[PDB]
Structure 1
Amino acid sequence: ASVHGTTYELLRRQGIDTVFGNPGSNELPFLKDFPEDFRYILALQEACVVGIADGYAQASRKPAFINLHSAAGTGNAMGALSNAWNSHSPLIVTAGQQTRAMIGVEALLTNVDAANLPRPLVKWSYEPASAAEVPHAMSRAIHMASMAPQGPVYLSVPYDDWDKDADPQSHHLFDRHVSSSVRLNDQDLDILVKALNSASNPAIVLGPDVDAANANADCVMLAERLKAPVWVAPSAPRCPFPTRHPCFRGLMPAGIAAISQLLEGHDVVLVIGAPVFRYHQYDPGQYLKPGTRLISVTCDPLEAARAPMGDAIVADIGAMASALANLVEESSRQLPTAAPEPAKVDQDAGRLHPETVFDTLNDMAPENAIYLNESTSTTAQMWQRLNMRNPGSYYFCAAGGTGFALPAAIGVQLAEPERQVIAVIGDGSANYSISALWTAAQYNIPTIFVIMNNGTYGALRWFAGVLEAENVPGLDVPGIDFRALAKGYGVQALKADNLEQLKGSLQEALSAKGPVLIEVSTVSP
């Protein structure tokens, strides 16, 4: 067998059947004779390729396979890799290298010092020392991406390797099963459970690895047993809990002092599947108030090491959430009372308040919709106004890097063909990965894109006001016609200048058979 044949057999035997890619010269010997059982999803720029693959991996809860061109293609994807690192996304990033005989001379298209290029944003990065090693290196990449804590990996392959003879012993790779589905030993788990059972006023904080594990329902059981309020850890990349469950208390503010104040009076705070904590604004004060202790369950040693407070347990979130939910006592305390619905903001017949947009989406979208957020000044209102009952219902750029949601929404829609995806993206953020629209059109992936057009980088403008910063340049983005951009890439487009038009546009979009972009005129901040 050839290295080509052996590698595609390994991929299919390990459950991989889709290549997200943007091709080049070094990759044609890999992509030729493309197997009939595989799908190739083309995107027009590599940030888009990786964003689409990332949304697909996050929603599918399985690794996604990517093929990019050498250094320039890998480089174009590295902002997308920063988000993927923070979201623990299992991405197998492959890139083609020059033929081994011209690597030394640094021929055009040589990826120099290739494995160092995507560092520090990958768990493992490698270029094999010979063609016959390629299947084994691919096996390593698959497992490294997939073991907890999941994350992106990188493999560079000289183009001449694919046609070489494979090692016959590579067949031992095909069916390897690798598990990290582990939980705390019984003795120590009993100690943890007793601490939870004897807490007087416990609180629960959940992060994105809960949703990645599909541990959401176990966390609901846990919260109901403990009678405990539940918050989502700050800077949330995913939604780990039903947002209208009576225990839910919303998105935590991303500040040190704000969080310790919020937790004051809670004697035990159990954090599951989050860093402790992804603060953002610098809000100095106590990490925890006297009387509060913290216990973190995390899949990632790096998170356990860097927490500034609390105990930690490094284990699989699915296994730990299930064990805790099933072992804790039912507390006789009263179940928390649901948060009240948000107020309606006054809305005239002109430009839309973001609150109106979210309320209207909540009114009209299916109950199993999936939302993506890259409307950076409106995140708090989004979290208050969307009833997200099911797992896998929310994605936000985990490193804060814009350019994620537009492509990721396409990948999520590909992963979840029966759940309507609605990406709510600011006019600023929409440009970073605008060409991803073309992939939705070409493959007829029916994502709905809601562009919140207020003419400015509002989250930045707000922060400039916060620092009392005068004369900051570059904050306004006038003069973009999103309906024309959508037409450019073959996506149906609508415009909503007021609430009547927003309702009419959403009705059409929800009825449509393909992707749709709605440009919404929103209030300037």
Structure 2
Amino acid sequence: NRGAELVVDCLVEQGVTHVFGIPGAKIDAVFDALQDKGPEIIVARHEQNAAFMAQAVGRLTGKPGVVLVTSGPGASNLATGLLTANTEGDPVVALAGNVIRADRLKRTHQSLDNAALFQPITKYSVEVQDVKNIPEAVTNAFRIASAGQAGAAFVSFPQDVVNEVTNTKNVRAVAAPKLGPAADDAISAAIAKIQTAKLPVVLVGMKGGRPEAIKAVRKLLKKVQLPFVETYQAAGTLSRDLEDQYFGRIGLFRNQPGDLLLEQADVVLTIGYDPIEYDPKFWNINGDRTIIHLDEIIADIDHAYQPDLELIGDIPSTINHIEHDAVKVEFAEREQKILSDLKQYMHEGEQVPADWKSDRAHPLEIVKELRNAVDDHVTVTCDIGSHAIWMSRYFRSYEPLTLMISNGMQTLGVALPWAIGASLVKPGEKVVSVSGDGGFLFSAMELETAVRLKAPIVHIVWNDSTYDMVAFQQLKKYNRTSAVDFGNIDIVKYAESFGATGLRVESPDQLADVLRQGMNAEGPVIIDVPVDYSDNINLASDKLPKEFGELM
């Protein structure tokens, strides 16, 4: 019963089932303590992927995912991982080791100021300097990682602290509390402003993408019949019932129907809106608009964002109090016409161009065939790139937490490790991950962990042989691409070398059969599907806002 046991004791109380990590000499006492009791250790092939996996656990379970690494380069490898989780509202607790307290100021092996390093990228970055303080520090980490808004917590343990034998008792895993609903006066005022609105619309954001949030949002949308829009991490709010009120997903560029829908609005209700997904300077422009901020925390005042009302409190509760006293909105003919046109423009946008001819599959063809090959309840984790732009915009998701996208840091390589984390959260279910050919290699080494776990993952690789998202953004600004090209690899040979299944779409017509082959395959499968990116530049085309400008 030494300090390392205390760390494990906390993990038990927090109900931690899995720990992702990589052992080392400085953190060895805690890994040793985990052999006697505590959660199952998932050994990672890189601490970055260990942090990503934990993030996936966080977003899916609502409870902090736990990552355990050693001092020095082990700790510093969690940097990007935690930074992503901290900016994308995913509860993660990081446990890292450090050199002994007596040599903490010295130039010794793997020593640095851990707490100072993770300070600007976490909600909580502390280093325990007394063994008695372990149960407190770790508990407060779990609570703070979870408390709205969710984020990353980092706890550093000097080696002599985790090895120290102590008679210190454990501490109760007091659950993070939930707020009450927003102020009654604030809700009453909000209902009033929505009822008097000529065209009210709902902007569902990050924290609205929580399951219980989605549950309450849907009840509201059905009763009041408001047209709504999603941010990328709000994917899954849409139901097939609410398809007639759905106006797509806003993000990246102001050239979507939702942006035009938001423009026409006179009252906008934002739900759990972290502006990181889409800056308000992009959508809230052109005329005085009423903004009602509903969130678990106060609003960030921007030039383009100055809420006329703030409903701060538990997001689902606050929505419930609104939905109860709200009544159906009747739209005038003019507003109905606008909604009709936008829904028309929206449908026109989801279609492959008529003049299309190619040896490869169009991105929309890859999107459509994938959704029809994947059940609604199946979790799909997506990477970042041009492929991500298509997925975020056109891949429909009808259930909470089934389309995971990195819309905070837009970190390359998140797809596959999220999928591995997701499969452990939902055992016995197939999990689909989508990535680019460039972003793939960022975390492809974690495929060994997949085969080892026999995880039912289907990884789709959009093959263009370039960092295209940077490329077409270079062409639009400088009329030339720079440092976006790299060599190709045999993706099938790559998979097979890890002990996984590798398939390949040789022709655009084989797409449907290859996908279903993978969805029925056993174990991890990587799928190489070449794509034609000649239409990608139109993702930033302002043709659509122009057409609607003239029509108005």
Report the TM-score, using the length of structure 2 for normalisation.
0.86
Q: CA deviation at 1:488?
A: 3.2
Most deviating of 342-351 and 12-21? 342-351
Most deviating of 266-275 and 334-343? 334-343
Q: Are 2:7 and 2:30, in contact at CA under 8 Å, matched by a contact in 1? A: no
Q: CA deviation at 1:416?
A: 2.1
Aligned residues: 516
- Pairing 1:195–2:193 present: yes
The within-5 A match list for 1:307-318 is 308-311=304-307, 312-318=310-316
Q: Which residue of 2 aligns with 1:47?
A: 48
Q: CA deviation at 1:96?
A: 0.7
Q: CA deviation at 1:391?
A: 0.8
- Pairing 1:508–2:517 present: yes
Question: Residue by residue, what CA displacement relative to the aligned partner does 1:243-275 show, whole Å, maximum 9, x if unpaired?
Answer: 642211111144579876542331100111122
Which of 420, 431, 443 in structure 1 is aligned with 2:441? Answer: 431
Q: CA deviation at 1:333?
A: 4.3
- In 1, the alpha carbon distance for the partners of 2:8 and 2:265 equals 53
Question: Residue by residue, what CA displacement relative to the aligned partner does 1:439-458 show, whole Å, maximum 9, x if unpaired?
Answer: 11111121210000111111
In 2 relative to 1, CA 419–316 (structure 1 residues): closer, same or farther, beyond 3 Å?
Answer: farther
Q: Are 2:236 and 2:397, in contact at CA under 8 Å, matched by a contact in 1? A: no
Question: Residue by residue, what CA displacement relative to the aligned partner does 1:425-466 show, whole Å, maximum 9, x if unpaired?
Answer: 111111111112121111112121000011111111110111
Which of 452, 471, 477 in structure 2 is aligned with 1:467? Answer: 477
- In 1, the alpha carbon distance for the partners of 2:52 and 2:283 equals 37
**2:238 maps to amino acid:** P
In 2 relative to 1, CA 116–510 (structure 1 residues): closer, same or farther, beyond 3 Å?
Answer: same
Q: Are 1:6 and 1:166, in contact at CA under 8 Å, matched by a contact in 2? A: no
Q: CA deviation at 1:196?
A: 2.1
Q: Are 2:382 and 2:414, in contact at CA under 8 Å, matched by a contact in 1? A: no
Q: Which residue of 1 aligns with 2:539?
A: none
- In 2, the alpha carbon distance for the partners of 1:375 and 1:163 equals 41
In 2 relative to 1, CA 126–375 (structure 1 residues): closer, same or farther, beyond 3 Å?
Answer: closer
Q: CA deviation at 1:102?
A: 2.7
Q: Which residue of 2 aligns with 1:239?
A: 235
SS at match of 1:94: strand
Q: Which residue of 2 aligns with 1:368?
A: 377
- Pairing 1:134–2:142 present: no
Q: Are 1:257 and 1:287, in contact at CA under 8 Å, matched by a contact in 2? A: no
**2:98 maps to amino acid:** Q
Q: Which residue of 2 aligns with 1:294?
A: 291
Q: Which residue of 1 aligns with 2:26?
A: 26
Question: Residue by residue, what CA displacement relative to the aligned partner does 1:65-103 show, whole Å, maximum 9, x if unpaired?
Answer: 111122312222222222212211100011111222332
Q: Which residue of 2 aligns with 1:448?
A: 458
Which of 361, 370, 374 in structure 2 is aligned with 1:352? Answer: 361
In 2 relative to 1, CA 393–167 (structure 1 residues): closer, same or farther, beyond 3 Å?
Answer: same
Q: CA deviation at 1:213?
A: 4.9
Most deviating of 54-63 and 177-186? 177-186
- In 2, the alpha carbon distance for the partners of 1:211 and 1:278 equals 12
Q: Which residue of 2 aligns with 1:67?
A: 68
Q: Which residue of 2 aligns with 1:94?
A: 95
- In 1, the alpha carbon distance for the partners of 2:269 and 2:196 equals 13
The within-5 A match list for 1:115-194 is 115-166=115-166, 168=168, 170-171=169-170, 173-194=171-192
**1:290 maps to amino acid:** G
In 2 relative to 1, CA 308–299 (structure 1 residues): closer, same or farther, beyond 3 Å?
Answer: farther
- In 2, the alpha carbon distance for the partners of 1:460 and 1:221 equals 40
Q: Which residue of 1 aligns with 2:492?
A: 483
In 2 relative to 1, CA 520–197 (structure 1 residues): closer, same or farther, beyond 3 Å?
Answer: same
Q: Are 2:198 and 2:331, in contact at CA under 8 Å, matched by a contact in 1? A: no
Q: CA deviation at 1:238?
A: 4.2
Q: Are 2:5 and 2:30, in contact at CA under 8 Å, matched by a contact in 1? A: no
RMSD: 2.6
**1:269 maps to amino acid:** V
Unaligned runs of 5+ residues in structure 1 are none
Q: Are 1:52 and 1:408, in contact at CA under 8 Å, matched by a contact in 2? A: yes
Q: CA deviation at 1:375?
A: 5.3
Unaligned runs of 5+ residues in structure 2 are 535-552
Q: Which residue of 2 aligns with 1:103?
A: 104
Q: CA deviation at 1:291?
A: 4.1
SS at match of 1:217: helix
Structure richer in helix, relative to its length: 2
Q: CA deviation at 1:423?
A: 1.2
- In 2, the alpha carbon distance for the partners of 1:368 and 1:177 equals 29
Which of 403, 412, 415 in structure 2 is aligned with 1:402? Answer: 412
Q: Are 2:465 and 2:485, in contact at CA under 8 Å, matched by a contact in 1? A: yes
Q: CA deviation at 1:277?
A: 5.8
SS at match of 1:115: helix
Q: Are 1:275 and 1:307, in contact at CA under 8 Å, matched by a contact in 2? A: no
- In 2, the alpha carbon distance for the partners of 1:2 and 1:126 equals 20
Percent of aligned pairs with the same amino acid: 21
Q: Are 2:11 and 2:39, in contact at CA under 8 Å, matched by a contact in 1? A: no
- In 1, the alpha carbon distance for the partners of 2:80 and 2:416 equals 14
- In 2, the alpha carbon distance for the partners of 1:142 and 1:353 equals 44
- In 2, the alpha carbon distance for the partners of 1:138 and 1:148 equals 18
- In 2, the alpha carbon distance for the partners of 1:71 and 1:181 equals 39
Q: Are 2:9 and 2:38, in contact at CA under 8 Å, matched by a contact in 1? A: no
- In 2, the alpha carbon distance for the partners of 1:413 and 1:384 equals 25
Q: Are 2:199 and 2:331, in contact at CA under 8 Å, matched by a contact in 1? A: no
Q: Are 1:261 and 1:289, in contact at CA under 8 Å, matched by a contact in 2? A: no
Question: Residue by residue, what CA displacement relative to the aligned partner does 1:466-494 show, whole Å, maximum 9, x if unpaired?
Answer: 10343x43111222222233233332111
- In 1, the alpha carbon distance for the partners of 2:5 and 2:223 equals 52
**1:145 maps to amino acid:** A
